[PDB]
Amino acid sequence: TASGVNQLVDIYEKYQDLYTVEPNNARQLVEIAARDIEKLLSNRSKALVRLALEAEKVQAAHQWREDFASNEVVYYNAKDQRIKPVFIEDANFGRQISYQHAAVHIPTDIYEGSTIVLNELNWTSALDEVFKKNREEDPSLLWQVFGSATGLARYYPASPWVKIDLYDVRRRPWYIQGAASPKDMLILVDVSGSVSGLTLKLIRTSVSEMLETLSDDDFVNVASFNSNAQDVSCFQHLVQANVRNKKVLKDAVNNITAKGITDYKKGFSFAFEQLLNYNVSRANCNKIIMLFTDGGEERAQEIFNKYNKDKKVRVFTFSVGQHNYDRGPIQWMACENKGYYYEIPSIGAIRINTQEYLDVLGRPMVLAGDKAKQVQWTNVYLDALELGLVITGTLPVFNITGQFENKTNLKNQLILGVMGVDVSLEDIKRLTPRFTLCPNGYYFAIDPNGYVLLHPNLQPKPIGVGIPTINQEPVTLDFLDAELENDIKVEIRNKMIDGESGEKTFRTLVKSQDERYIDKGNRTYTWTPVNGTDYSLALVLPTYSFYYIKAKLEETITQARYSETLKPDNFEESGYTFIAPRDYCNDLKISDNNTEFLLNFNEFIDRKNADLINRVLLDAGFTNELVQNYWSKQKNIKGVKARFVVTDGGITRVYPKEAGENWQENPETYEDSFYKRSLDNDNYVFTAPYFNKSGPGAYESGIMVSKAVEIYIQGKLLKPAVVGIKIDVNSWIENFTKTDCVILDDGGFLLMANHDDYTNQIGRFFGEIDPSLMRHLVNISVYAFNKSYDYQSVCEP
Amino acid sequence: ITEQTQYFFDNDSKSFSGVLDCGNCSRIFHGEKLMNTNLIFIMVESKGTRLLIQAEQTSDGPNPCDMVKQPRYRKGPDVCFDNNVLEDYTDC
């Protein structure tokens, strides 16, 4: 009676016009979104290709000057002959931009004006023209970066660098992805008595700073030999170097101690055995062993002749520490195999040495002329210029000095570096318009490794690992770890990775938007691969989201009264009115001052994406009609503290105009928990307020109710809006009294308990009130539970 | 890595009853679901253990030593440029 569900249904029905219930095909939509994202990535790939060719061409003709005192090189250092820039405070990046000269970022420990940096700056000064050409032939392109292999970083939109600047382009994920092919490392940390002391600390730090340089598609393990080749971890084979396994390996390395007698033969035999463990799903290429040792005197010739006969493996060796032992065997080991020998005197040399093996690993791909010029996208990762979540494209640029002269006797087998472009996930999130879907639907895409990309539960902050401690890693959520995991969904994940395109339907569980409920529901999936790249876009529609209410309007008078309907001055007679933040053609987004956004909307509509505005105004009109017809008439029913209605678009109306002052729900209805849940279920749903909140509630707000207004417009189930009442707690407590009686809901939240002490603590999860009763209640086949994991959350300890 | 939890109805049955055996004692409960509504009504006896906390709390993820035994399906790239004969091994 209070909300008046049938009243809203009749209001919708009587206006059979003003509607066009188009069906979300759920396959054509997926295909078109896939094509659009592929087109975007193709634009970026084209920009990368042209930049790479230009860089190669310009480098080819440099002449290697060596006297830069005269004809000084002019550039703009980021950490500010330097240039004096003028910055346009463009809103695309959220910081300062210039658009007329490419900044530079020389890492702190590199000298500004050496004989190598200066040459890099000169010969890259030609890249500015092509940068401008790229950014001009199509705007909305965020960053073009050039991580040359000398520490530089020439990114075109010149902004001041974002305190000790530790950035070093040769270590970023988007550089390693380009500089080398995947790897199968095996770090032979030398924990023998000869390294105890400082050298052990250097070994542990170096191993950590090396594991920092492994992507998610290249495996790793950490052996250690002291006359016995144990494993510092619990793995015993290669483990994919996720963001998590890296944690275990780092902890194991940190908790290591020297002992025993050095024995290279046994350690290397064990290592080469571990690289022949083909039945553990290894990455079959770049079989690498990277021995960490102080110094040795026994070159294990026998083992290198038994195994690695065909030079399959690539043995690198570091003579870490400041010592005086023989470095002959180590150099010979690095030389005989297709390896390379380093030296780590002390901290400070770790960062610039552990990353150098990529230069060696790039030799085969350089020797393969253009078979490697393939744009290779990375996995999501927070920007380095506080921009958000961006995936990067990479395209290595080779060194052609003597090409077409055919000298082929030079250092022509090394890459200049990697030149990459960044795509904001906020720019893929507008090629997948979620608004036409119901609040339950959404898109998502996955790497071939399964890690998500463009997923609603992908919050922008680093993925956490392990419990915190008392005192840059990519954001990689596995698609099963972003949603509830059951038997069926794993099949869908497996079928997306292979690229098989298909459709599936079933009944499953969906975690509520506030992480306090679970609901059964049907979710007609959909998945196709984007032929351009290695991704498989998906789309999850419930069974009632197939059709959406599009709005068509031409009178200019009906939309007129709809437009002045929701004016802030009409709240007293039309109730409060939020508006969700939705990107109109050019309207500025919300600054969480919903009133100011509403005023801006008023001005824009007074002046004059059109469907979105059309349909939000349609919802405004219908909600006004409902409230004025019924809510205004039967004002202040006995047990109704506040009457509220939520629709799509963002028209949230709360009648009293005072409860709106106590309306904690987000204006974006697609993010309101009760809306999605109320849509999912088929009965009134009660959402107990949280307990011990800073703000008020549960006595001056009243518990909430909701019931989606199902519609039969022409024989199709639609659920546009949701209506409910914040039932006053006191009157309903009286009603309860007139009948230890406890009223409870799924999620174990006390809506009531006759005992007066309990009802004071209304809304707490029952279970910290009388545990044993629930503990047994779970036992009798009611109140099951699912104990999932959240990988993005904040803890104080 | 917190650890969320949720509780929800399993069976379609509406009436539930039994006895609670906290310790050397008995209690009476009768559970009834308000039909056409997401609510359950129960009547426990007067008061006379270990708290359930549905609120998420910090913890560690799955024991990685376990999931590595049966790692999730994964299809890596298949280019991996390496093993080229025309390579100069004269660096060291």
Added chain:
Amino acid sequence: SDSSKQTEAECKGNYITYKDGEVDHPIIQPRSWENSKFDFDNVLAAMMALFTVSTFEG
């Protein structure tokens, strides 16, 4: 000042030094291509240094 730059030309600009050897907590410091306190650049300087050695201090 840095131990990994063995020439005057490649010893310039700031660099990173870690407090008490802790891998975290870097400190930025300049590079200086300084000689030893006592040097054998000249016969006079050599006599000076070798006199300090004759005192068993330094």
